[PDB]
Amino acid sequence: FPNITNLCPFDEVFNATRFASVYAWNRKRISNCVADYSVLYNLAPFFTFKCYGVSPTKLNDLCFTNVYADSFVIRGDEVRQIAPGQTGNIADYNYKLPDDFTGCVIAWNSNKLDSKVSGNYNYLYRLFRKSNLKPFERDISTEIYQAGNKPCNGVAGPLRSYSFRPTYGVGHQPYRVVVLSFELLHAPATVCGPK
Amino acid sequence: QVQLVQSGSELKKPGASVTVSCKASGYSFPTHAMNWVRQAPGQGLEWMGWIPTYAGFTGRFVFSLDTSVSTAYLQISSLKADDTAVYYCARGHVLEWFQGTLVTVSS
Amino acid sequence: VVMTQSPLSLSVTPGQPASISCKSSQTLLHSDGQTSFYWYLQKPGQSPQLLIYDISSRFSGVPDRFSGSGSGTDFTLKISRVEAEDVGVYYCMQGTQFPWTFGQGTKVEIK
Ligand SMILES: *[C@@H]1O[C@H](CO[C@@H]2O[C@@H](C)[C@@H](O)[C@@H](O)[C@@H]2O)[C@@H](O[C@@H]2O[C@H](CO)[C@@H](O)[C@H](O)[C@H]2NC(C)=O)[C@H](O)[C@H]1NC(C)=O
Ligand SMILES: *[C@@H]1O[C@H](CO)[C@@H](O)[C@H](O)[C@H]1NC(C)=O
Numbered sequence: 439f440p441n442i443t444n445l446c447p448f449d450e451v452f453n454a455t456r457f458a459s460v461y462a463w464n465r466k467r468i469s470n471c472v473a474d475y476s477v478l479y480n481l482a483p484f485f486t487f488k489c490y491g492v493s494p495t496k497l498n499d500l501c502f503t504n505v506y507a508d509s510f511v512i513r514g515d516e517v518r519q520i521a522p523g524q525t526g527n528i529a530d531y532n533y534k535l536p537d538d539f540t541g542c543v544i545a546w547n548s549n550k551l552d553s554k555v556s557g558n559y560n561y562l563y564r565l566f567r568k569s570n571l572k573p574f575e576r577d578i579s580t581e582i583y584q585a586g587n588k589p590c591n592g593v594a595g596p597l598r599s600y601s602f603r604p605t606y607g608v609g610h611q612p613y614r615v616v617v618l619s620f621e622l623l624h625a626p627a628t629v630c631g632p633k
Numbered sequence: 634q635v636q637l638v639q640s641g642s643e644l645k646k647p648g649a650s651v652t653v654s655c656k657a658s659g660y661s662f663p664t665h666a667m668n669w670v671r672q673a674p675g676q677g678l679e680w681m682g683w684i685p686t687y688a689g690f691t692g693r694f695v696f697s698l699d700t701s702v703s704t705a706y707l708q709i710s711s712l713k714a715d716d717t718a719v720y721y722c723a724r725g726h727v728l729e730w731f732q733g734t735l736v737t738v739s740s
Numbered sequence: 741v742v743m744t745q746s747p748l749s750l751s752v753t754p755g756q757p758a759s760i761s762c763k764s765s766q767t768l769l770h771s772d773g774q775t776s777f778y779w780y781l782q783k784p785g786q787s788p789q790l791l792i793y794d795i796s797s798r799f800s801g802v803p804d805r806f807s808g809s810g811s812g813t814d815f816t817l818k819i820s821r822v823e824a825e826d827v828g829v830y831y832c833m834q835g836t837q838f839p840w841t842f843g844q845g846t847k848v849e850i851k
């Protein structure tokens with residue numbers, strides 16, 4: 439708004455050559471930039487664009503204190519878990535939204551970039567935890583969790599991989615997910631476009 | 634999209650060392666991806682090395698980058714060579730993109 | 741490593757579609773997370789830019805005029821409309837996120 443001429447680097451989030459594991463996701467902060475949500479809308483949203491608390495149509499004129507971009511890769515059937523009120527392996531152990539979230543979740547099919555014929559095994563996720571994960575919490579440690587009936591200082595009585603291959607139907611294809619979390623009017627707003 | 638800027642050229646005598654500059658535009662990162670690539674006079678292009686490592690060639694060409702700016706530091710420990718090549722700075726984070734510079738040695 | 745571009749050069753007629761190809765003994769994966777094959781364009785006096793291919797059908801990059809394809813042991817790049825802009829040398833490369841080996845280049849001249 440107040441003579442900001444910088445443009446928001448959405449391309450440095452959305453066009454990235456490498457994406458993070460579900461846990462240890464990339465978290466970038468955008469500030470002191472003019473928003474332009476024309477680009478992130480009906481250009482390349484592909485599969486989905488679901489917002490909570492805002493009407494995407496007028497998103498360019500709202501003005502946020504800060505915008506945070508959480509970026510990661512998940513299996514396609516799990517896309518529905520990146521949403522307020524959801525449960526499951528991603529929602530409970532890897533990435534959780536607050537249920538009063540005011541941002542936008544954008545996702546698309548990356549099978550052509552991430553899947554390999556032999557299988558892309560570089561994407562990991564958390565399967566086990568002693569308790570559920572809190573919103574935006576990150577925990578990247580390894581605990582050889584599967585004690586079963588005996589505490590272990592060995593292996594088992596940790597984390598698991600995804601297997602991404604171009605032919606595993608549809609629900610098993612990888613998806614790139616970007617979550618734009620909005621910090622609205624907690625301090626005078628800094629990021630908007632036309633206003 | 635992301636542009637790179639490099640010093641246009643360098644010239645120095647054999648036995649001396651040089652450093653080649655590069656900076657990228659951008660705002661933030663968790664990590665780094667980049668490559669130094671060389672184009673010998675009249676040949677195709679060769680990899681010099683990735684984030685400070687080697688392409689298989691070691692010795693004269695070594696390097697150490699700090700960040701997204703001064704992301705460069707290609708260093709030649711010795712100019713006693715016929716390596717009067719064009720060097721390129723390659724961006725590896727959004728869309729691959731190249732910029733380059735000419736480094737020579739006089740007689 | 742083979743990385744060899746077959747044609748020396750293409751026809752110079754403006755408006756005439758033409759194609760080039762690169763052969764290898766490295767036809768499948770080279771990379772760590774994806775594929776094994778790219779094309780670069782170097783205009784005289786300029787740094788190269790990127791055109792993108794894969795093992796299974798795929799094609800990307802910034803311009804939408806060009807088309808990549810391949811089969812067997814040979815990778816192909818073709819140009820449809822020829823505006824005489826595409827004058828320079830086209831090269832084949834095998835890395836991805838991963839660095840690379842590289843081909844010899846082929847000359848495209850348009851008159
Ligand atoms: C992200 O990149 C696109 C262009 O990238 C293309 O599409 C991607 C999905 C991928 O396949 C790439 O390999 C492709 O090259 C940017 O789109 C540009 O938007 C401006 C808006 O004014 C338009 O003028 C350009 O013509 C578009 N470019 C192309 C090639 O069509 C997009 O802006 C980038 N940023 C974001 C946040 O998406
Ligand atoms: C975006 O595209 C949908 C159709 O996919 C259309 O109904 C909608 O009106 C478009 N939005 C805007 C702001 O034009």
Ligand SMILES: *[C@@H]1O[C@H](CO)[C@@H](O)[C@H](O)[C@H]1NC(C)=O
Pocket residue numbers: 495496497498499632633
């Ligand atoms: C935001 O984008 C929509 C797209 O239809 C446009 O109509 C609207 O005028 C833009 N907002 C402002 C404040 O101009």
